[PDB]
Write a protein that binds this ligand. Structure first.
Ligand SMILES: CN1CCN(C(=O)c2ccc(F)c(F)c2)CC1
Ligand SMILES: CN1CCN(C(=O)c2ccc(F)c(F)c2)CC1
Length: 460
């Protein structure tokens, strides 16, 4: 029975509005409704992994698991296994997998982050799950961010707190946050970004939605504009939105957007918005393709519609050679040549690098670099040809070309990371000096760049 090199992943996000779901929610898991929808000819084909995020979820874990599992068994005639379930207040994540994957999944982690302080602490935050699928690390975050049209900056702050403090994946990757710990990271939820148009324009917006003319609305979507300005979700992807705003509906129909201010809303307007979103970030040159992104039309218990997204995702096998794991394979080597980091910092410490990768027996510390001043005010840290030669556990190019090297640049004075990035070993050539590049971030914000050349020796 061969190990897969691709899987498909279902991501759902639904703010349930504190109401029990209707009796049938199968359209959600089938990617049917509005937007980029799934072909009918696929309806019986199970996804490999289903990841369900809810917000304002009124059900117990047991109650929701029974609905989810029996929904999937009805669609697929497969009884899924529960990988993980984690709940913070009314924010929940469920991961379900086909039974054939049970012994391919390991290292399951769960965590949550509570956002805000005093007043603003007690209902918003995030839950997440990570695990290994054979050789591939997968991370999933369901966040419910701060509400309100005039709180985009708070949402951005919530995002940074979640990626800083959510403790998922390999704890040995100590310099790295969740935006670098996984081959594939999916981040979804009620992100609560709004369409920023004047309140007076509510009926105009509704008109546009009824005509399926979303372009003049999406140009004012706060998540797209904040992403464009590099204020949030740096280096993440989102499929094009081709479905109607998913909030705020009158319950029990989808014919009416309920946008006017009420005591129940704190006297706030809720103009129609794409609150409910799926984004992802995968390591460079790993296969990931969005095959659906849309909303259901027939699930109407909430003031939000459910959102679905599905992905093809590249995965790798748990590789064994006669040498590694358990030793190095001297027919393999990774040389980082003529490298330099460009940093936005004003500090004047010396810096060193750490190289982290599951192709190494443990992380590798470099010597300190040589600081120079850049022509436009910057710090340039030069490493020359000084960098340690990295010794992979397995030399086989079928393994090594699928790997990645995480890089942290750390202060000698504090040992704190000033920037993190990732280099793919999916090179155009071996035994050949080739350019490499990564942006560097810290707490998810751009702090610099790392560039130079690589020379990879494999057994072939
Ligand atoms: C509640 N727990 C029970 C223990 N548990 C597993 O045994 C498990 C391991 C791998 C899988 F893929 C899977 F679906 C399940 C995870 C959930
Ligand atoms: C297919 N990908 C390639 C990478 N990518 C961008 O470079 C990007 C361009 C414009 C943006 F507003 C933004 F937020 C990001 C996202 C799309």
């Amino acid at each position: 029975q061969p190990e897969p090199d691709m899987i498909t992943i279902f991501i759902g996000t639904w703010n349930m509005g504190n109401a029990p779901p209707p009796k049938k929610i199968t359209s959600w898991f089938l990617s049917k409704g509005q937007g980029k929808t799934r072909d009918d000819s696929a309806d019986y084909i199970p996804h490999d992994i289903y990841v369900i995020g809810t917000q304002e979820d009124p059900l117990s874990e047991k109650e929701w698991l029974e609905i989810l599992k029996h929904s999937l068994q009805e669609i697929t005639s497969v009884t899924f296994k529960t990988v993980a379930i984690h709940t913070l207040w009314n924010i929940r994540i469920v991961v379900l997998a086909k039974p054939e994957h049970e012994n391919r999944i390991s290292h399951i982690c769960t965590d949550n982050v509570k956002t805000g302080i005093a007043n603003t602490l007690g209902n918003k935050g995030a839950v997440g799950v990570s695990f290994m699928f054979n050789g591939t690390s997968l991370g999933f975050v369901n966040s419910h961010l701060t509400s309100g049209s005039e709180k985009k900056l708070r949402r951005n702050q919530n995002y940074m707190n979640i990626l800083r403090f959510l403790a998922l994946g390999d704890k040995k990757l100590s310099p790295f946050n969740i935006t670098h710990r996984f081959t594939h990271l999916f981040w979804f939820g009620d992100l609560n970004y709004r369409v920023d148009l004047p309140t007076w324009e509510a009926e105009t917006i509704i008109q546009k939605i009824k005509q399926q003319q979303y372009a003049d609305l999406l140009s004012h979507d706060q998540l797209l504009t904040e992403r464009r300005e590099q204020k949030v979700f740096l280096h993440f992807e989102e499929e094009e939105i081709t479905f109607a705003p998913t909030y705020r509906f009158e319950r029990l129909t989808r014919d009416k957007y309920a946008y006017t201010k009420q005591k129940a809303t704190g006297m706030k307007y809720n103009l129609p918005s794409w609150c409910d979103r799926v984004l992802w970030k995968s390591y460079p040159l790993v296969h990931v393709v969005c095959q659906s992104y849309g909303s259901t039309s027939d699930i109407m218990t909430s003031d939000h519609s459910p959102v679905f997204a599905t992905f093809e995702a590249g995965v790798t096998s748990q590789f064994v050679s006669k040498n590694g794991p358990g030793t190095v394979d001297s027919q393999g080597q990774i040389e980082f040549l003529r490298c330099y980091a460009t940093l936005k910092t004003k500090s004047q410490t010396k810096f060193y690098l750490e190289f982290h990768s599951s192709c190494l027996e443990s992380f590798v510390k470099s010597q300190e670099g040589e600081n120079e001043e850049g022509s436009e005010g910057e710090l340039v840290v030069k490493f020359g040809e000084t960098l340690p030669k990295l010794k992979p556990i397995i030399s086989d190019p079928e393994y090594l070309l699928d790997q990645h090297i995480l890089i942290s640049i750390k202060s000698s004075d504090s040992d704190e990371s000033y920037g993190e990035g990732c280099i793919a070993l999916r090179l155009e050539a071996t035994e050949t000096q080739l350019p490499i590049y990564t942006p560097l971030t810290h707490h998810g914000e751009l702090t610099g760049h790392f560039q130079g050349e690589i020379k990879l020796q494999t057994s072939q």
